[PDB]
Amino acid sequence: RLKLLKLERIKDYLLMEEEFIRNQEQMKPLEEKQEEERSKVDDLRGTPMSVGTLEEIIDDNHAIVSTSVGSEHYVSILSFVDKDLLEPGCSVLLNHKVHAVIGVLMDDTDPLVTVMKVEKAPQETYADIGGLDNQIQEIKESVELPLTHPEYYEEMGIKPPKGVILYGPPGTGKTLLAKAVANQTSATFLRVVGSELIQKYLGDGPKLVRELFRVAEEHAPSIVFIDEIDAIGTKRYDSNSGGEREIQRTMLELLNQLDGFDSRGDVKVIMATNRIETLDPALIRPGRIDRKIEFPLPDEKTKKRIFQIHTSRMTLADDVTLDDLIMAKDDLSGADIKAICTEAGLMALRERRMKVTNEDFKKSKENVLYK
Amino acid sequence: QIKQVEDDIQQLLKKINELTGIKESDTGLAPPALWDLAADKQTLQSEQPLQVARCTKIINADSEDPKYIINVKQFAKFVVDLSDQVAPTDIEEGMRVGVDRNKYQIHIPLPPKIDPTVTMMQVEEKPDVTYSDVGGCKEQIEKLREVVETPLLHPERFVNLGIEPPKGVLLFGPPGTGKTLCARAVANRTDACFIRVIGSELVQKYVGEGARMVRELFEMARTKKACLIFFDEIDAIGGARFDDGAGGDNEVQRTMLELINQLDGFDPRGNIKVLMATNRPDTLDPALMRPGRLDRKIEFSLPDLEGRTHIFKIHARSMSVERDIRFELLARLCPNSTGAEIRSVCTEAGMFAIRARRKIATEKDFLEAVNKVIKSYAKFSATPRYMTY
Amino acid sequence: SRRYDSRTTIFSPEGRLYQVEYAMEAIGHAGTCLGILANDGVLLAAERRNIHKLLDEVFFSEKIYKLNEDMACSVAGITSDANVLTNELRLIAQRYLLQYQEPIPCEQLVTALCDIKQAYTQFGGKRPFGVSLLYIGWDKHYGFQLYQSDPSGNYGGWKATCIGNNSAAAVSMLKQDYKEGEMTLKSALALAIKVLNKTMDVSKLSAEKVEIATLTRENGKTVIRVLKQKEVEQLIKKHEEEEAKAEREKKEKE
Amino acid sequence: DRGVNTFSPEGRLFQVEYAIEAIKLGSTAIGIQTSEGVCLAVEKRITSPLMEPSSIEKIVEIDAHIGCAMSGLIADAKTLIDKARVETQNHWFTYNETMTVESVTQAVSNLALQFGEAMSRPFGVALLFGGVDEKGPQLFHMDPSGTFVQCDARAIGSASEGAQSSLQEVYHKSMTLKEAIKSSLIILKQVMEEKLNATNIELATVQPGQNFHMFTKEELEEVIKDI
Amino acid sequence: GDSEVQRTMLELLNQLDGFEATKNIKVIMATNRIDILDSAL
Amino acid sequence: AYAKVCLYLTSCVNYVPEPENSALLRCALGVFRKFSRFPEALRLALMLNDMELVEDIFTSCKDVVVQKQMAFMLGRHGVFLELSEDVEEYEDLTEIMSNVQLNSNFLALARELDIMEPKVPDDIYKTHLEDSARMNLASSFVNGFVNAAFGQDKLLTDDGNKWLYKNKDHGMLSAAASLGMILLWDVDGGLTQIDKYLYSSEDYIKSGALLACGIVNSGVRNECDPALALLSDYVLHNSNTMRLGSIFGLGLAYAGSNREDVLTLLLPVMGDSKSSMEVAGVTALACGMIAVGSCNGDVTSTILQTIMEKSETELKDTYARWLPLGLGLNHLGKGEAIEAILAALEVVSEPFRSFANTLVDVCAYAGSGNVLKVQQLLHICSEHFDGAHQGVAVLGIALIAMGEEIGAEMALRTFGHLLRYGEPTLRRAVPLALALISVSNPRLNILDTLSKFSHDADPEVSYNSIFAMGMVGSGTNNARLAAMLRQLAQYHAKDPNNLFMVRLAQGLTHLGKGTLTLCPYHSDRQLMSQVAVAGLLTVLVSFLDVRNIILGKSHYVLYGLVAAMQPRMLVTFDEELRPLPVSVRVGQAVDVVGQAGKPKTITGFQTHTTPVLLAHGERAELATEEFLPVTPILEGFVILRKNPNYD
Ligand SMILES: Nc1ncnc2c1ncn2[C@@H]1O[C@H](COP(=O)(O)OP(=O)(O)OP(=O)(O)O)[C@@H](O)[C@H]1O
Ligand SMILES: Nc1ncnc2c1ncn2[C@@H]1O[C@H](COP(=O)(O)OP(=O)(O)O)[C@@H](O)[C@H]1O
Ligand SMILES: [Mg+2]
Ligand SMILES: [Mg+2]
């Protein structure tokens, strides 16, 4: 077949390659054998290799390396190193006696990277969400669809939306869709918060924003989820030395990172809030974030769906009617519904039964949903 | 035989690796192709390491045998002399002397220190945006092009008339009008050192660290022959100085004043041309706005009807639109809109087509996109505030 | 163009009146008040935030005022705004009486005061009256009536309702255990007592911490009487007996 | 900036010009004046089929010899129309004659900047007063700035720029009223967001003779068939 | 200013609300006043 | 059905051993003729090298417009069919075949994309942001490359005697032929300028102007025969001093024509032996270029006699490499047939054997993809002599493997390993072969490797790597590569012997301000151009020894590079040869390969109005179904008809 002949035209050149590689390896004069070269590398790299910063690169075979003690040795860089992955500020391995650049480092990631990355799939899924059909559709079109079927967008000739805002009152499924997207997506999920962006010293906020988005690029394809972005605003903290204006400069750094000079890689931004009126309109502009999607309080059908979802695992008593909860005609949220169910279970175990009852649900009403 | 062929291919790859070099990236090692051991042994046996110091003073600078006071950073200060391979004139009283160990004399003159943060600002990879990707701001493009490119491309037409071209521009306008887009276009089209700076990148935690890196940025630009600097989001540090009573913004005002003195002070600023991108050109200091520092202020006002039609054309060039476009109708239907709004309209038309599972975007899809991006999102618009700003 | 204006009567990015709703939540922080309708009469209970020991008793009421012969109101929120609103209510009722030679209907008086409320929420820069009213009255058109009006100038007719602290819990309880074509004054008083108990759980409903006013009809006249400490203590004792009996029955069943 | 009567550094009331911005959001009205009369054709933006098209009143009768085509904000338009009608009737009552189009337009325009802190903001409506008076047919354009000027052919509204470019390309001083209506409908159809169907446009004519006349559906259909 | 303790609670709770792989990390907080507690908490 | 068949047959032909490729091509051609897809049939016939079938299909074509577009395609490939005087529009078809009007079309594209403003060498150098005869030579070379085919400049079209005299020694020839290449592609009115220069008192200048005439006529075909006249008049009697300009100009001018008159004029000057070894080599080279792919017995025989006659030490001396090179160019792509020539060369001489044998073998198996042949080459590579045959062998792997999109990248990997494990000559040669395997095709591993090894200690490896990187960027002026070449100029500021190569790379990268391509293939990635591959192989085999050929006095081979200069064009024409500016979309390559999914769908849509200057690997299809294209593939000039079905 055509593909079989392609793979054969690959394997034959490969066999040619091993033939040549062997031939040369043996006619080498008992030297330069890959293992022999590696042993010579070990010999010339020294038994200890100090880790020091690379202050600047002057040219190939030369560089200024700052030792941990502060000395600034101008020293050669040997053929061993790739002469790549070397940028000012990088770690470098230095021969103990001559301080020659003989390796590079930073194979490990930072605690900030570890905390931001979500090295797990949240158990919540789109099936565990009831009522947010349009919001799910739009967030999928923004985050998942361009990753799973880029053919649609490439054929249509458009680029997918870069950002999405989930705006809604206190508890409507915004972080829930964030969890579902993290669960189902194949991209690296980086979670941050606005109060978590508000830093203490001057210049830490912008530095953290830059670090977060640099990590997102390094781990691209990535989804950066900034929950409660209005926390960078509404909330005021004394730890913040600069104050309102340092907050403004952090917001400006966010502006630049979302849409600035540097060309972004594959980093889709999700950003959630319940006070979207306090956000800077420049932050929300279409180039930085389009798809501002609302999360209204569930209607009667959606509330019924929430109760079905959150009671699917509870052994509701035959007399229990999951209809009086909905008939309670207040600003009931999905968070309220889940808390009512959870505290009903708590009273069930308190009063020793494994089956939840109407009285348990009513006292849960009166306890958590204080109305 | 397909699976046999893949198995053989991977076994062949494994053998090639096992006999050439496989995995050495943990300690940032290189593939063994460019391993010149014969040369590196002579390098380590013939090129001694040099500790970097600074020549503080030249005692007896006259032709008589001089002496140089070096200050090996954080190590010690010494009186030393030059290597016989180094000419006296190659070393001044401020150059990084670069002296060896062991009778610290084997000199190598060494350039000024640059903070890694500052030096990681040169635009190495040029943006993929061109001047043809910007529409509706023809005069702004012409003026910015003049200022930044034309002196750097054909200086003869300027020295013939004896003109000093304007050196400094302020691209100012509402959020999303082509400011950063035009900066990226300039960076792409320019053959010179382009250094991007972000206003938030000049906020540093220790007093005199913002001004320090402003000085380092400008002196690196000076070391380079032809440099364009681009302060984006200049609102961050550039703000009118106010006395207050609690010393607020003293540090940012100090770094701004350092930038002011570097742009126009008691010194020839050099062959540096500066761009200032902003959407709040009402906080900027009057000294910063003085035409000795921002010569060619340019306004990226919201595009008119022709500009909006041109932007729609630009953003729909590569789309799968149908026969009849009526992008002029779309432009009149979405007035006082930004290029960001227009690109979002085009994208939303494409997404409506995709959602309907069509491969052709039609005028109805575009009208739905306009309704979604211009009308429904009208409450999140930044123009009503930033036009006043 | 003023710097000090504060723009009291503007709309918000969303059609949500900030001053009116801040007044609403001031009502919420204020003391609790509730009203119950019943075929024989209407009643209005009210928590007291003047429970200090050195505080004298000089009026016949502190949360409850009389508007005219057959109508009373109760205020939640700000006491001074409540006083001015009650004075205006009395003026409106007496103007209607002077004009038509008959008592103002309850809905008409509520509508007049709510018109004043809406005028303050729309005109001028003055802050709205942070006061919520519960009116209980009688008139020859629909007999005993209960109304509840908010700072926004919105009023609604209720069979049983509550304003002030924990008003949401009180109204939920009334919804649970209020009977429409039943519940004469005796059961209405019992229900008000139990609602006040579960609304002021912090304190076990000391008779001095609440005030109850009952409006009824006798021989064609309307009588508005504030229940004395004796009667309030009797009602609290009866509720405590009933609660103890219910707890004993539940425990015995278990 | 803060306040309705603040001047911009360039010389600009800020509120007249925000009103101009508001005008650029309205339907497209086109007025032409010719020796044989004045034509006024205005797009009637019907958003739903359930909207009675006849209830969209963008062409109004100031008097028997003056009509007004409004664009921008129709309620402010209506206020100005009521003022114009009252002024014309007052002038007739006092002088026993008819307001000139220039006189009525200036009387209406003198009410355009009478706001402060009465009106709190300018009128966000642009008007085309097409009338016939002692000196023949005259079309006057007024804008929120209160500056009125009589034009041989004007096009206000969202499609103002393109409509007026086409009016340049087509209009000539020695044309007939029939061809003026023809060209106005062609331009209005070209700039129309939907198809021109004879129920989504208002056409009116003021001639040296018969009073201000608003074309019925039959005449509109005849002209639209002709185009 | 606002409460750093409440900030820390809110961030830790945001993590634990499904973004934590581990299952046995409980969060307890102590306060003197109930009303002043942040509406987010 | 049709798609399945044709696509599978094409792919298998590219990916199949020698014996089955011909049969698969026959059946592919049969299917195309059965379904009446005449342009496809013509493409298959040309790639088969079946001039008889080409004539049969072309004559069977009775549509005037389709025949004219076939004529355009065949002219771009390079062939001059001797059509009889009874066809559909004989004169128009013949002139289209001759490729005239190319000057007008190129100027029209320049005007549509304004590039007529001359760019002086200093403009591209941009020295204001970062010697002697060497710099003059480099500046003239880059000026010519950048202003090729425009007939416009600022150095020579203006006061030009100053530039000529600033150039020294062979710089005279350099400048004159640079002017020729500036006036390339049907500026035959420029015979006036080049004649009023060759009316000179200086031998170098006069011969360089003769070479300029030859190069201007290169690619061109004029029935007036504007080259043979000048070339014969100058080369008839003076066969003692230099003659290289004349012979080379004739060869470059005519190339694929294969005209017996020029063959029989070039053969005696080679066989006389009174002309220096340089002239003999250049004459064999010109014969090969004239007859790129013929199995021509006369050329083969004369080359064999020349090799036998030349002394042993003469064969040792360089410039003998061009005689087996000429023989290979003659036996270009003919495949196995060469066995007789291989045996003859084997019995000719022992040491010159390896060189001549490998050169002819690789130049005959160019594009075959014979894995066993490449294995023989790699065994020759493994056997280290303790070198010229080594270098030509590496060039041979490149030449034979530049046929498959997979084998090409794998040969790039093999070249990387060859440089890793190589010897001096092997490493010196690898950059040239790695340039051949990718020409005018920027690739971010080729560029990186060549840039890395430009700094290499070995000066000759640096020379070859820099020229190779310029080659890869040829006609594709790229910001990254231009900045890289400027950085290399800064690096080797002092080294003139290498800065000359850096400047040459800069100019060759900015070729024509960016209009052309030196890639041998064309159309849709499988159509070898014999003339172009001959020119490229000439230049690279000459560079195999870089110091004594290019850095010495033999850059007329750099000027022979022009044999591969063809444009990246998408001009569209009316049925009567008139411009038709039509919206056209562009992109690189996309599809779903299910069964035989065509890779014709393009996703990088970029609407343009013809003329369009498409890049390497981009397919441009029509914007709307208003015009039908007679050619299934839109490359080069096209004739578009009005779709009678519906606009
Ligand atoms: N005039 C324009 N022509 C084409 N595209 C435009 C134009 N204006 C904006 N855009 C689109 O919007 C984005 C460019 O916005 P840009 O980053 O330059 O905004 P800005 O004016 O710097 O605003 P900000 O204040 O938010 O930093 C790109 O998506 C570009 O496609
Ligand atoms: N369909 C739903 N709508 C709203 N909330 C839901 C739904 N399904 C589950 N929840 C519950 O809501 C909580 C998430 O609320 P969240 O979106 O974080 O609100 P916010 O982000 O505004 O604080 C989860 O604890 C989840 O169990
Ligand atoms: Mg949340
Ligand atoms: Mg920007």
Class of domain D1-227: alpha beta
Q: What element of type H or E holds F480?
A: helix F479-491
Q: CA torsion sign, A207 to A213 to A216 to A220? A: negative
Rounded Cα gap, residues A276 and C113, in angstroms:
36
Select the residue of F416, F483, F605 nearest B33 (Cβ to Cβ): F416
Rounded Cα gap, residues F319 and F328, in angstroms:
15
Q: Residue B187, Cβ neighbours under 10 Å: how many?
A: 22
Rounded Cα gap, residues B115 and D197, in angstroms:
70
Rounded Cα gap, residues F283 and F301, in angstroms:
14
The interface residues of chain A toward chain B in range 56-85, judged by CB-CB distance below 8 A, are: 56, 58, 61, 64, 69-76, 78-85
Q: The tokens of F327 are what?
A: 């023989």
Select the residue of D25, D162, D191 nearest B335 (Cβ to Cβ): D25
Chains that touch B (3 or more CB pairs under 8 A): A, D, F
Rounded to a whole number of angstroms, the CA Rg of chain C reads: 19
Q: The tokens of F293 are what?
A: 């792919």
Q: CA torsion sign, C180 to C185 to C190 to C192? A: positive
Instruction: Please state the three-class secondary structure of D30-53 as a single string.
Output: EEEEECCEEEEEEECCCCCCCCCH
Select the residue of F417, F479, F605 nearest B126 (Cβ to Cβ): F479
DSSP secondary structure string, F23-92? HHHHHHHHHHHHTT-HHHHHHHHHHHT-HHHHHHHHHH---HHHHHHHHHHHHHH-------S-STTHHH
Residues 6+ apart with CB under 8 A from F168: F132, F133, F136
Rounded Cα gap, residues B240 and D186, in angstroms:
55
Which residues on adjacent β-strands are paired with residue D67? Answer: D61, D130
Say what the alpha-carbon torsion angle F72, F77, F82, F87 is, to the nearest 10 degrees: -30
Q: Is C169 on the interface with A (CB under 8 A)?
A: yes
Q: Is F489 left (phi over 0), alpha (psi -120 to 50) or beta?
A: alpha
Rounded Cα gap, residues F630 and F470, in angstroms:
36
Position B298, amino acid: I
End-to-end alpha carbon distance in chain E: 17
Question: Is residue C69 in some structural domain?
Answer: yes
Question: Is residue C253 in some structural domain?
Answer: no
Ligand 1 centroid from CA B177, angstroms: 5
Rounded Cα gap, residues F410 and A14, in angstroms:
8
Pocket test for ligand 1, best of A162, A259, A284, A290 (most atoms within 8 A of CB): A259
Using a CB-CB cut-off of 8 Å, the residues of chain B touching F452 are 34
Residues with CB under 6 A from ligand 1: A 255, 259, 282, 285, 287; B 134-137, 173, 175-181, 277, 279, 311, 314, 338-340, 343
Total domain count, chain C? 1
DSSP secondary structure string, A88-141? TT-EEEEETTT--EEEE---SPPHHHHHHB--S--S--GGG--S-HHHHHHHII
Asked if residue B178 belongs to a known ligand binding site, the reply is: yes
Contact of C136 with C42, CB cutoff 8 Å: yes
Asked if residue B180 belongs to a known ligand binding site, the reply is: yes
Rounded Cα gap, residues B317 and B350, in angstroms:
13
Contact of B234 with B284, CB cutoff 8 Å: yes
DSSP state for residue A234 in the 8-state scheme = S
Contact of C75 with C67, CB cutoff 8 Å: no
Say what the alpha-carbon torsion angle B6, B12, B17, B23 is, to the nearest 10 degrees: 20
Q: The tokens of F193 are what?
A: 């300028």
- Say how many residues make up chain B: 389
The angle, 0 to 180 degrees and rounded to 10, between the axes of the packed helices A358-367 and A334-350 is 120
Contact of B330 with B339, CB cutoff 8 Å: no
Instruction: Please state the three-class secondary structure of F223-268 as a single string.
Output: CCCCCHHHHHHHHCCCCCCCCHHHHHHHHHHHHHHCCHHHHHHHHH
Rounded Cα gap, residues B372 and B366, in angstroms:
10
Question: Is residue C254 in some structural domain?
Answer: no
Using a CB-CB cut-off of 8 Å, the residues of chain A touching C250 are none
Rounded Cα gap, residues A224 and A216, in angstroms:
7
Q: Give resolution in angstroms.
A: 2.9
Q: Do chains D and B touch (3 or more CB pairs under 8 A)?
A: yes
Atom 21 (ligand 1) nearest CA: B176
- Say how many residues make up chain F: 647
Position F299, amino acid: V
Residues with CB under 6 A from ligand 2: A 129-132, 168, 170-176, 272, 274, 306, 334-335, 338
Residues 6+ apart with CB under 8 A from D122: D15, D16, D19, D112, D113, D115, D144
Across the C:D interface, residue pairs with CB atoms under 8 Å apart total 6
CA distances from residue D26 to B335, C197, D21 in whole angstroms, order as listed: 11, 61, 10
- Interface touch B319/A157, C-beta < 8 Å: yes
Which residues on adjacent β-strands are paired with residue C68? Answer: C71
Contact of F629 with F640, CB cutoff 8 Å: yes
Q: Is B371 on the interface with D (CB under 8 A)?
A: no
Q: Is D52 on the interface with C (CB under 8 A)?
A: no
Instruction: Please state the three-class secondary structure of F323-388 as a single string.
Output: HHHHHHHHCCCCHHHHHHHHHHHHHHCCHHHHHHHHHHHHHHHCCCCCHHHHHHHHHHHHCCCCCH
Q: CA torsion sign, C140 to C146 to C151 to C153? A: negative
Select the residue of D21, D162, D193 nearest B336 (Cβ to Cβ): D21
Q: Which residues surround ligand 3, an ion (CB under 5 A)?
A: A 175
Pocket test for ligand 1, best of B172, B180, B385 (most atoms within 8 A of CB): B180
For residue C117, the enclosing domain spans 1-248
Q: The tokens of F440 are what?
A: 């005018």
Q: Look at residues B282, B308, B274, B316 and name the one whose alpha carbon lies nearest to residue B178.
A: B308
How many angstroms from the chain centroid is the CA of residue B91? 32
Ligand 2 centroid from CA A175, angstroms: 7
Q: Is B3 on the interface with A (CB under 8 A)?
A: no
Question: Is residue C146 in some structural domain?
Answer: yes
- Interface touch A98/B385, C-beta < 8 Å: no
- Say how many residues make up chain D: 227
Rounded Cα gap, residues C40 and C184, in angstroms:
6
Rounded Cα gap, residues F118 and F147, in angstroms:
7
Q: Is C1 on the interface with D (CB under 8 A)?
A: yes
How many angstroms from the chain centroid is the CA of residue B46? 40
Residue A77, classed as helix, strand or coil, is strand
Chains that touch D (3 or more CB pairs under 8 A): B, C
Using a CB-CB cut-off of 8 Å, the residues of chain D touching C1 are 2-4, 6, 117
Question: Is residue C205 in some structural domain?
Answer: yes
Rounded Cα gap, residues F417 and F449, in angstroms:
12
Q: Look at residues D9, D62, D18, D22 and name the one whose alpha carbon lies nearest to residue D40.
A: D62
Tell me the backbone φ, ψ of residue D155, rounded to 5 degrees. Answer: -135, 110
CA distances from residue B37 to A46, B34, B371 in whole angstroms, order as listed: 14, 9, 68
CATH number of C9's domain = 3.60.20.10
Residues 6+ apart with CB under 8 A from A106: A90, A91, B28
Q: Which of B154, B317, B327 should one mutate to test binding to chain F, selecting the residue with the greatest count of F CBs within 10 A? A: B317
Residue corresponding to tokens 């799968």: B320
Q: What element of type H or E holds D190?
A: helix D177-191
Q: Do chains A and B touch (3 or more CB pairs under 8 A)?
A: yes
Rounded Cα gap, residues A186 and F344, in angstroms:
64
Residue C15, classed as helix, strand or coil, is coil
How many angstroms from the chain centroid is the CA of residue B154? 23
**Spans of all domains in chain D:** 1-227
Q: Look at residues F211, F204, F290 and name the one whose alpha carbon lies nearest to residue F248.
A: F211
Contact of F455 with F462, CB cutoff 8 Å: yes
Position A267, amino acid: V
Rounded Cα gap, residues C68 and C26, in angstroms:
28
DSSP secondary structure string, A2-34? HHHHHHHHHHHHHHHHHHHHHHHHHHS-S-S-H
Using a CB-CB cut-off of 8 Å, the residues of chain C touching A365 are 172
Chain B residue with CA closest to D191: the answer is B329
Select the residue of D1, D161, D162 nearest B388 (Cβ to Cβ): D1
Instruction: Please state the three-class secondary structure of D109-173 as a single string.
Output: HCCCCCECCCECCCCCEEEEEEEEECCEEEEEEECCCCCEEECCEEEECCCHHHHHHHHHHHCCC
A216, HSE (Cβ side, Cα atoms, 13 Å): 25
Rounded Cα gap, residues A342 and A358, in angstroms:
14
Rounded Cα gap, residues D207 and D104, in angstroms:
18
Ligand 2 centroid from CA A177, angstroms: 8
Contact of F522 with F77, CB cutoff 8 Å: yes
Breaks (C-N over 2.5 A) in chain F follow: 130, 386
Q: Look at residues A25, B3, B13 and name the one whose alpha carbon lies nearest to residue F413.
A: B13
Q: The tokens of A115 are what?
A: 């905390």
Contact of B144 with B299, CB cutoff 8 Å: no
Q: The tokens of C174 are what?
A: 């009334």
Instruction: Please state the three-class secondary structure of C168-200 as a single string.
Output: HHHHHHHHHCCCCCCCCHHHHHHHHHHHHHHHC
Instruction: Please state the three-class secondary structure of chain B as a single string.
Output: CHHHHHHHHHHHHHHHHHHHCCCCCCCCECCHHHCCHHHHHHHHHHCCCEECCEEEEEECCCCCCCEEEEEECCCEEEEECCCCCCCHHHCCCCCECCEECCCCCCCCCECCCCCHHHHCCECCCCCCCCHHHCCCCHHHHHHHHHHHCHHHHCCHHHHCCCCCCCCCEEEECCCCCCHHHHHHHHHHHCCCEEEEEEHHHHCCCCCCCHHHHHHHHHHHHHHCCCEEEEEECCCCCCCCCCCCCCCCCHHHHHHHHHHHHHHCECECCCCEEEEEEECCCCCCCHHHHCCCCCCCCEECCCCCHHHHHHHHHHHHCCCCECCCCCHHHHHHHCCCCCHHHHHHHHHHHHHHHHHCCCCCECHHHHHHHHHHHHHHHHHHCCHHHHCCC
